[PDB]
């Protein structure tokens, strides 16, 4: 794996000798929980939704309020 043997433009990854082409099913299988993997993106949606409330409130009243429960 010298980094110079490209399967497509911008894709030159190769397994190192003795290691697997894919990790699923190998002994290095990261075995990630799909539900854990999705948590960050759900958190960012919730933050984006709260921020949108604060912006709408500022446009409605002309006064900034952070706590969404007080809008």
């Amino acid at each position: 794996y010298d980094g110079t043997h490209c399967k497509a433009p911008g894709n030159c990854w190769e397994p190192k000798p003795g290691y697997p082409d894919k990790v699923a099913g190998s002994k290095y299988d990261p075995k990630h929980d799909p539900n854990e993997l999705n948590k960050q993106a759900e958190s960012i949606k919730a933050m984006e939704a709260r921020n949108q409330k604060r912006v709408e409130n500022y446009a409605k009243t002309g006064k900034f309020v952070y706590k969404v429960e007080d809008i």
Binding site: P9, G10, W13, H32, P34, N38, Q40
Partner: peptide, 21 residues
């Protein structure tokens, strides 16, 4: 510099959903 890579690479240079974290 098309040899840098262009489209689909944010998915195709990972295995499965590993890009999510």
């Amino acid at each position: 510099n098309p040899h840098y890579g262009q489209f689909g690479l944010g998915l195709s240079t990972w295995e499965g959903d590993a890009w999510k974290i």
